[PDB]
Amino acid sequence: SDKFSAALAKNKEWAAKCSQEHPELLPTLAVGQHPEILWIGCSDSRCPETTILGLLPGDVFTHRNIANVIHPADLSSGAVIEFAVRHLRVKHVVICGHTKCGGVAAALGNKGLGILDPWLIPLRQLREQHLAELQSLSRDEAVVRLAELNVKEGLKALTQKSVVLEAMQERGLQVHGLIYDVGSGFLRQLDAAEPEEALKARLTSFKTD
Amino acid sequence: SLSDKFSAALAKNKEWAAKCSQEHPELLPTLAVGQHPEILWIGCSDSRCPETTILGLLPGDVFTHRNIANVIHPADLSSGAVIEFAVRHLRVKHVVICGHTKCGGVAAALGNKGLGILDPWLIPLRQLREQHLAELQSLSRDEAVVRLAELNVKEGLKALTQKSVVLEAMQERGLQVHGLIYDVGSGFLRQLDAAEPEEALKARLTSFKTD
Amino acid sequence: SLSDKFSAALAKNKEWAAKCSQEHPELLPTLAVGQHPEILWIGCSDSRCPETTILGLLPGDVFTHRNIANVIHPADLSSGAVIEFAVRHLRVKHVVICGHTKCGGVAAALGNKGLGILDPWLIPLRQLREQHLAELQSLSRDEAVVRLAELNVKEGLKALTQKSVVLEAMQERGLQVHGLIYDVGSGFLRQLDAAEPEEALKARLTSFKTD
Amino acid sequence: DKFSAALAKNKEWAAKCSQEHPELLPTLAVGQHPEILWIGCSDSRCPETTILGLLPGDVFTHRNIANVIHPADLSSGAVIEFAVRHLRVKHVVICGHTKCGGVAAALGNKGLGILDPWLIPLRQLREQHLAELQSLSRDEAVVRLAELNVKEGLKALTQKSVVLEAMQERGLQVHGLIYDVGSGFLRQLDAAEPEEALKARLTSFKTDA
């Protein structure tokens, strides 16, 4: 069965249902978006943000990439963060990793993957830093642990951006780390504690005028 | 409201997980064994274009990349890595590039306001604006936004087919590529005609196919 | 030891520092006060194209960026940051893009061997190969390398003039841009004619100059 | 006109070079075999071939603002891959310099447009070493951050499989230098890392055969 032609038919059925059951929603969204959440998650087909959050179109500004990696100088994630934080003024930035992330699993192996190798470098940087801890775990346990370390490192890379530090001080922007369990459907919050003195050093080092 | 949208979203997630356990208890545990999506979706980050919702599909159906204005920069590692993985490893049957009506990324490229880090990101849209300037200036402002959104999807399909991994999959298994526009006002997807002369793809094969 | 090129280079550095102190004792201390180069050079990393040597110039004269095959990716931060700094802050009067004969980067783009991380880097040369394929196929292999090297310089000058900082400097203070080919066999630089129809530069100004 | 003057000086240099090293340019035309890859600053005061007292063909060169190695940068990535795997250079040199205004800009808090994402790695080092940098004078902090940047660059360089392979297979060496723009001297940084550091890097980054 052609999944593309099947998807177009299901789109038309969904759009007609939306007109019947929430007739104001799509026309009000056409006037302009006002999402309160920026979601940075994995491209993994099992992590569709709006479905797993039980939300609607217009609720979640979304960036998805392999293993939800934030490269500090990546223009793709950089442009979405600039737009979502400065222009849409989202109240929340969520970084969501997930269980059974094959990107994280690839980083724990040493098989050459072409253009994927430079993309996964930040996961291999965390692997080197945390090697003794990761080697003490089973492969399945290491995949969860490195997925968590990657979310926490992402929150650090996110808060190293002046536009985020500005929004946190000016209008109480909040940032959050999650792990999605692909087997249960539950989001879990990471404790993601950093000393107060961590954000002070970051403000000094990264906030610009 | 007075409601924290983050804590409200976690509560709704638990309600959705409860519904999955009650109505389709096999689905999430079978997906945890491994994904097998047949579709790679490259679309806009715009909150109004959630691919799995608007396609009426489930988790596991759509491998997804979303960025500002669904732009494919040829040497971007972010889109590059997702295309390599989806095409070579997951062996998707379809790559969809979906633009949308009222794309403010496309609209920003038709303006000349300095937007900081967004300026280098939108360069491919300004390249299309320069190439098609006479055509775009002959339209109304709102028609030029729709037209540039279409040209951007078509240019994205060209950038996509400049990748050896995609040309190989098109030859080896008839991987298909599709250009769509999402109408944020109606919820309908429409297909772009997106024909290219045969001699276009032959020159591309010669110029970009790699061992 | 005596065959180590690195320890030999450090010894030659100390000999060069001694020569500077003996022959031009004011030069290095006056440069330490601040640089004022009038030229930004964008050239190939090729060991045969050291800009300051081949121009017969001194330290402080040439602000320099060198990469594989002197390629300007429009959204590359590495070349982007050097252009912003050289044009807006140092206020260079000249931006030079220098290609060269026997550029193996240009030759690699005319081949179809997979080269790992070099593949995405060379995409702009394969874009030119696809656009100019009939012309390149009508030439010998060696002539196609020279022609693609020239097209690459000219395309770089286009990418350079798509940047508002360059367009601003050209309009406000007569910044000039130049395309060169370095002949690695003779040591001579030759200028490329690099003329563009008037309507080309007007569309670029409209599409890329910031308000 | 500095540009037309430079083209005239080029022609004079090429004619002189045919007299003084009559066969050098012709040997160069048949191919290049440099033994050194130089990664340095774009600063007009740091021309590698001049300050090393070397000739064309001796130094494969990459220069960027503040000699920064972004791990997933294709520009520096492509030159390292080509120089190490194809030319088989014996030495990779990362050269920082005194009075580097790129390093100085990272110690400031002015917004600089497209320069901001480029300088993030220097601001990462500033945050990590902030107590040490704040304890120094302005001019001493610039020298210190320039040194930390070279050392961090050598770490990013050795996180690349192509470099780790060459070090193991053929004793490729990597070196950190600071160029003094006022004296003309290169000095070597001690750049010591525990043995356990390079073992974790090999485990985390070297691609399987």
Ligand SMILES: CC(=O)Nc1nnc(S(N)(=O)=O)s1
């Ligand atoms: C090599 C590689 O990237 N493998 C992946 N496996 N799953 C991935 S996911 N969770 O990003 O879809 S990526």
Ligand SMILES: CC(=O)Nc1nnc(S(N)(=O)=O)s1
């Ligand atoms: C400056 C800029 O990028 N503006 C945008 N407006 N909407 C965008 S969208 N459709 O990508 O959400 S981007």
Ligand SMILES: CC(=O)Nc1nnc(S(N)(=O)=O)s1
């Ligand atoms: C594979 C590849 O890139 N080959 C090269 N040959 N010479 C180059 S040069 N002129 O940039 O040094 S690049």
Ligand SMILES: CC(=O)Nc1nnc(S(N)(=O)=O)s1
């Ligand atoms: C803001 C900025 O980049 N300023 C610079 N000053 N000197 C530089 S150098 N040493 O790279 O030429 S960069």
Ligand SMILES: [Zn+2]
């Ligand atoms: Zn994943």
Ligand SMILES: [Zn+2]
């Ligand atoms: Zn959009």
Ligand SMILES: [Zn+2]
């Ligand atoms: Zn070259």
Ligand SMILES: [Zn+2]
């Ligand atoms: Zn410098």
